[PDB]
Amino acid sequence: EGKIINIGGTIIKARLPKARIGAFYKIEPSQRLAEVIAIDEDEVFLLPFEHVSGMYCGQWLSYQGDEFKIRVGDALLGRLIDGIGRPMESNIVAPYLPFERSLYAEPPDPLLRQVIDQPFILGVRAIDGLLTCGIGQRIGIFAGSGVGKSTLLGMICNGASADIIVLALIGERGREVNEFLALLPQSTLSKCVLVVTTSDRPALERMKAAFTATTIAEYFRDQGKNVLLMMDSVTRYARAARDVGLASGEPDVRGGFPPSVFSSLPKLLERAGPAPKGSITAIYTVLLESDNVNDPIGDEVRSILDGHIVLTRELAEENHFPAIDIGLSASRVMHNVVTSEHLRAAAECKKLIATYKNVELLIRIGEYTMGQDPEADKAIKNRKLIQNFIQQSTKDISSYEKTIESLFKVVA
C-alpha cells in the first residue's frame, strides 16, 4: 500500500517504499489502475489509466502487478482492440485469447535478419514505379496537417497484398475508424486487427497503443507468416510520451521532448523488419510539427528508417494528389529488389520530372528553342503522360505489372 500526496494534471505523485518501475497499482476505493514511471526515493510518479475525477490527498494504493501484459492469441482477427489490449466492440461475443505477452520485447538479432529481395505490391503508382517497397522494409510518410497521410494509407490498405494486416490508429480522430472500415472488404477484413485509440483517450493508452500493435504484429510474425503493420501518426505517440515524461521531472532537450522519447523511439521502430521466421513490414505515418525538416521528431525518424515518402502541401495547393514529392523522397531497398531496366526507367522519369520542375519558367517567358537541350525536349513532350502516371484517384488501385508497363510507356 501507500499514500497519494500530489495530484497534477497528467501525473500522480505518491509515497511507496521501494516500488518498481512498471509495477502497476490499483486505487483502493475506486477500482482504477495506475503504473509507476519514476522514483524519487520515496515519491513515486505513477500514471493513471484513466481521468482524474476526484483524487483527494492521502488516498490509498495497493499492489497489483510486476509489469503490464496483454492477452494475445489467434482468436483476434476481425476485432477492434484499444491501446491497452481490451476489446472495444461490444456487439460481438467475448473472445478467448490463450497467451499473454509483455509489451517490451527486444528486436531480432541483426546477424539473423534476412535480405529483402521480393517487392511489396502496394497499389499506388508512384510508390511502385518510382519508389518500390520491399517485403520487410519500414517506410515512413512525412507530411504536415491534412496533407493526405490518411488517404495514402487508404490507397495502400485497400490494395495491399499482405497475409495479415495490423492497423494502428494512434491518437487520431474517432470519426474515421468507420472510414477505414468502409474501404476494407471482408476478404481483407477477415484477417485484419485494428488497434485504435482516439485523441480523447488518456496519455498512456495513447502512448502504449504502438507497443500493443507491435506486440500483436510480433505474435503473428512468430507464427511464421509475413504481416503488414501500419501506424497512423506515431508523432501522436511521441507527443503522448513527451507529455508523460516531461511532467515527471525530466527536462527539455530539443523540442520540448525529453531524452526518453529519443531513447524509446528507435526501439519501437526497429523491432519490425525481417526476422528468422516471418517478417513485419511496417508503414509509419509521421506528422511533422510545422512544414519544416528542422523537426526534432521527424528528422530522427527519417534517420533510422529505410524509405521516406515526403508529401508536400506546396503540391496539395495545385490539387496534385497524391502529393508525393519525388525529389525529397527515396526508398533504400529498390536497388535490391527490382529489375535493372525498371531502375533505369524509374531514374529516367525522375530526371524528366526534375527537369520540368525548372524548364517551364523559360516556357512561360518566351526563351525556348526546341532542339538545343534534348532532355527538356523530352521532359515537356512527356509532361501529360508523366502527370497522368503519377497522380491517381483514391479508388484507382493498380497491379504491379500495369504500373511497370505504363512506366515503360511513359519513358519510351
Ligand X SMILES: Nc1ncnc2c1ncn2[C@@H]1O[C@H](COP(=O)(O)OP(=O)(O)O)[C@@H](O)[C@H]1O
Which residues of this protein are in contact with ligand X, per CB under 6 A?
143, 145-151, 303, 321-322, 330, 332, 394
Q: Backbone phi, then psi, for 319, in 5-degree steps?
A: 55, 50
**Is 226 among the residues that bind Mg ion (CB under 5 A)?**
no
**Nearer residue to ligand X within complex by CB, 36 or 297:** 297
Write each residue from 75 to 114 as x if it is in contact with a second copy (CB under 8 A), else as -, in one continuous string.
-----x-------xx-x------------x-xxxxxx-xx
Cell readout for 334 is: 529498390
Of residues 76 and 407, the one with the C-beta less far from ligand X: 407
Q: If binding is defined by CB under 8 A, does position 40 make contact with a second copy?
A: yes
Sequence-ordered list of residues with C-beta below 8 angstroms from that of 275, at least 6 positions apart, any chain: 108, 112, 113, 114, 221
- # binding residues, a second copy (CB under 8 A): 138
Closest CA to 104 of 56, 202, 31, 35: 35
**Closest separation between CB of residue 389 and ligand X, Å?**
14
| Residue choice 260, 385, 386, 398 for contact with a second copy (CB under 8 A) | 260
56 or 187: CB nearest a second copy: 56
Report in angstroms the alpha-carbon separations of 320 from 40, 88, 133, 137, 325: 54, 37, 22, 27, 10
Closer of 35 and 172 to Mg ion (Cβ): 172
Q: Tell me the number of residues near Mg ion by CB under 5 A.
A: 3
- Backbone angle region of 233, left / alpha / beta, with phi > 0 → left and psi within -120 to 50 → alpha: left
Q: In the 8-state DSSP scheme, what is residue 28?
A: T
Give dist(CA 201, CA 150) in Å, integer: 20
> Of 185, 366, 401, 412, which lies in the binding site for a second copy, with binding defined by CB under 8 A?
366
The string of DSSP letters for 160-219 reads ---SSEEEEEEEE-GGGHHHHHTT--TTTTTTEEEEEEETTS-HHHHHHHHHHHHHHHHH
**198 counts as binding Mg ion under rule CB under 5 A:** no
Is 392 a binder of Mg ion (CB under 5 A)?
no
Torsion of CA 186, 181, 233, 209, to 10 degrees: -70
* 362 vs 399 by CB, closer to a second copy: 362
Does 262 count as an annotated binding residue? no
Say which entry of Mg ion, ligand X, a second copy, none residue 322 contacts (CB below 5 to 8 A, set by partner kind): ligand X
Q: Is 248 in the site for Mg ion (CB under 5 A)?
A: no
**Residue 143 near which of Mg ion, ligand X, a second copy, none (CB within 5-8 Å, type-dependent):** ligand X
Q: Does 150 bind Mg ion (CB under 5 A)?
A: yes
CA dihedral angle for residue 172, residue 178, residue 180, residue 184, rounded to 10 degrees: 160
Closest-CA residue to 113 (of 249, 206, 31, 221): 221
Beta-bridged to residue 232, according to DSSP, are 169
Judged by CB under 8 A, the residue of 33, 247, 385, 386 near a second copy is 247
Binding map of a second copy across residues 184-223, x = CB under 8 A, - = no contact: ------------x-xxx-xx--------------------
Nearest of 358, 336, 389 to residue 114 by alpha carbon: 336
What residue numbers does the annotated binding site cover? Answer: 146-151, 172, 176, 232, 294, 299, 321, 331-332, 392, 394
What residue numbers does the annotated binding site for Mg(2+) cover? Answer: 150, 172, 176, 232
* Residues within the interface to Mg ion (CB under 5 A): 149-150, 172
